[PDB]
Design a binder for these strands. Structure first.
Lengths: 214, 215, 214
DNA sequence: CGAACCCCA
DNA sequence: CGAACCCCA
DNA sequence: CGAACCCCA
DNA sequence: CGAACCCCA
């Protein structure tokens, strides 16, 4: 249980809210995002010094298939990486850059591996799997009186809690919390869909860190 | 035994709650709040004696069944049952909207809710459970045609839990009543929330184990 | 000495100034106030984290009778409580709520006791007494050449210094220092007059605390 | 040591 | 030792 | 410690 | 000793 550090003192808590007008939508081929944003300032969710350490991370989401993909009936398997960048750069990376996958394998993410040229830059500290299946029927319409359907796993609940990891970041001068302000140790959340199966997400996450330095 | 009750040398008391018949828990979309800790004061075995009590074990048995209104659509879902401990009760009975602060777009899916941060030192959740139901869009009262049949997995479920770990310390005001207005500290709440757009009802009964103490 | 626990460095010092246009005036029935206000910010009188601990408190004042009460000649006895609230609320409390006193005892404060319903909410960590008397003569007028007067205790000096207490507060997010921003552990200064004897005050107080947390 | 975050024989 | 304040090889 | 020749509280 | 910075029998 105790893989953290701050004991007697509590830890600061930053939250992320994805819902309503802001919802993660995953097109075929994956999507990249940075969960580590910390503004600098007085507020409790902000940071203080230029150096931070993250300890625990918690994830809660609700996945649901897209009406476009509800047309076909097929199964699939998705993947969620958690990736740690040592040497960030101005450009925001895309999954095509992190994993080098010949275009014929675009359909199936679960077979991807981290590209070899970058082997000392990016490293994956966690990996998870999940699977969805659609019978070819949306959930908004009424069955006929003749027959029924068992819709197993039309939408799923996905939650993980991991205390093991640790990360050390160093921030530039600027008070901003964007991607351009991080000198080292970024962190990324990568989602990739199954074969030809798009979906969306709803939920929220939390991080636990403690400013340190100067 | 496997026992963390701390006080069974003599026979702990047993308050019961009966939900059935005209009184059945019905859950509309958005959850429902209730207080399971009611203790009248008096001579009877189920009543209390002093003004201070300690609860140890709690047992729960219920039968969930989908509602005819929701049986029209066919979709799955997931429900949640919290067990919540209030340190500082107040006159007005709380609603789930107050305990969890959930933006109205997340009303559909309970499993993503977290305790609101403002109140972080007031309410605390000592247990959490999950369950899931699915409806094929067919009520159980009608006869299939001779042509085909159906496999109705999980049209209704059985839900039971038994937990000895918790402990709770309450202090009661002067009044002999056992209502919500009579508790000075340490309330306890049972919260049910449905899946997405799926209402249901319940039947069953619960038991508590406590021991009067004080004065 | 003992009590303080801030020996290596110095303690932060917040001050309160009551004088001039701002002077405490006590109508019959007492008055409530909150002495614990701490703004958040860079300044030294401000706080830093969301959690503070107060140690020592010092009080200096000059009490003087009111011209309205100088009409009658009678004695009396006042009281000053120092009250610690565990569970604050939006509405600011009034003495009528803290002490439940049947209206016939309004005249004499010294007989009040903390109400029993609330016995686990409010607690009094200090209590003091003082007494004043007015001969029915204001101090601005000249005696006749026939006689004189000895005006004992027309106005008094009141000072106390107490290191014993300790208090632990937790503040909400907002940068404000008002009453609405405190989650737990408020602190109150309560003044109540004698029988039918109003007065005013002048002076200043000091607190000693040290931010802690995050 | 005093008075009251500050000092020193 | 089971199920659940109640029991006993 | 994780995932899988690569890392570190 | 659970769930998830917060608690205690």
């Amino acid at each position: 249980r105790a893989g953290s550090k701050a004991d007697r003192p509590s830890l600061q808590i930053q939250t992320l809210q994805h819902a309503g007008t802001t919802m993660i939508t995953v097109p075929s081929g994956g999507v990249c995002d940075l969960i580590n944003t910390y503004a600098r300032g007085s507020d409790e969710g902000n940071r203080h010094t230029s150096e931070t350490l993250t300890y625990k991370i918690a994830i809660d989401y609700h996945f649901v298939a897209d009406a476009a993909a509800c047309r076909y009936s097929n199964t699939g398997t998705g993947v969620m990486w958690l990736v740690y960048d040592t040497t960030p750069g101005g450009q925001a990376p895309t999954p095509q850059t992190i994993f080098a996958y010949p275009d014929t394998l675009k359909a199936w993410p679960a077979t991807w591996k981290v590209s070899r040229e970058l082997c000392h830059r990016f490293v994956v500290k966690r990996r998870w799997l999940f699977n969805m299946e659609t019978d070819g029927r949306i959930g908004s319409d009424i069955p006929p009186s003749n027959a029924s359907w068992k819709p197993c796993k039309r939408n799923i609940y996905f939650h993980k809690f991991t205390s093991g990891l640790g990360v050390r970041t160093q921030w530039k001068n600027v008070t901003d919390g964007g991607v351009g302000a991080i000198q080292r140790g970024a962190l990324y959340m990568v989602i990739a869909p199954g074969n030809g199966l798009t979906f969306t997400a709803h939920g929220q996450t939390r991080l636990y860190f403690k400013s340190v330095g100067n």
